[PDB]
Amino acid sequence: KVFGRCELAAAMKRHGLDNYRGYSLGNWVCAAKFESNFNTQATNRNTDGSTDYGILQINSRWWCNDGRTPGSRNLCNIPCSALLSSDITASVNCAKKIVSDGNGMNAWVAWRNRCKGTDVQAWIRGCRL
Ligand SMILES: [Cl-]
Ligand SMILES: [Cl-]
Ligand code: NA
Ligand code: NA
Numbered sequence: 001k002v003f004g005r006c007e008l009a010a011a012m013k014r015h016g017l018d019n020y021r022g023y024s025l026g027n028w029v030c031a032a033k034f035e036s037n038f039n040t041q042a043t044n045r046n047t048d049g050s051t052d053y054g055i056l057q058i059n060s061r062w063w064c065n066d067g068r069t070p071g072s073r074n075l076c077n078i079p080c081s082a083l084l085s086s087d088i089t090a091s092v093n094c095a096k097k098i099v100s101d102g103n104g105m106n107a108w109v110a111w112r113n114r115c116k117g118t119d120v121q122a123w124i125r126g127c128r129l
Contacts, residue, residue, distance in 0.1 A: 001086035003038040003055070005029065006127035008088075013129055015092040021099050025129075026120035027111065028095075032056060033123065034110040040091075041084050054083035054091045056108070063094055 003011070009029050012018070018025040035057040036042035044052045050061040050069050060069040064080035076094035083091050098107050105111045 001040050003032075003040075005033075005038070005123065006129075008032060008038055008055075009124045009127050010129060011088055012092065015089065017092060017095070020096060021104065023099065023105055024120065026123040027105060027115060029123040030115035030118070030120050031105065031108050031111040034114045035108060040086055040088065043084070051080065053080045055088060056083075056091050056095050057110075058083055058091065058094055058098070063098065 009025055012028050013025055017023075017028050032038055032055050036055045038055065040055050042054065042057065044057065046052065046059070048061065050059050050072065051066060052059050053064065053066075058064060058076070058080075060066045060080050061072045063074070063076045064078050064083060065072070065074040066080040076097055078090055078094065083094070099105055101107070105116070
């Protein structure tokens with residue numbers, strides 16, 4: 001599923017991401033825009049052999065099991081394919097574990113390089129929330 005901007009904001013808010021660990025909703029929508037272009041089916045392979053999955057591009061070396069990342073952990077205890085669903089519940093619950101691990105949203109390279117320090121509230125402007 002390819003989400004609309006305000007559609008995704010509303011979905012993330014209902015799942016408890018607004019201000020989670022201090023990150024306003026605009027941060028999560030900006031991260032999804034540049035990680036996946038709001039497409040839940042997005043996948044990208046990394047140089048080390050791991051793969052990134054879903055709307056928030058969660059990586060198989062630490063967070064999910066895809067059966068082809070040797071020596072990986074499965075810290076969200078989920079198959080990576082569950083992160084591609086049109087229902088974002090599994091992606092959100094895993095993102096909450098990631099963002100609590102110590103480095104905040106800097107775990108997402110695109111947030112650091114394209115959202116951090118910008119006017120992120122613009123990503124929710126005009127939405128009925
Ligand atoms: Cl915001
Ligand atoms: Cl980047
Ligand atoms: Na929308
Ligand atoms: Na893994």
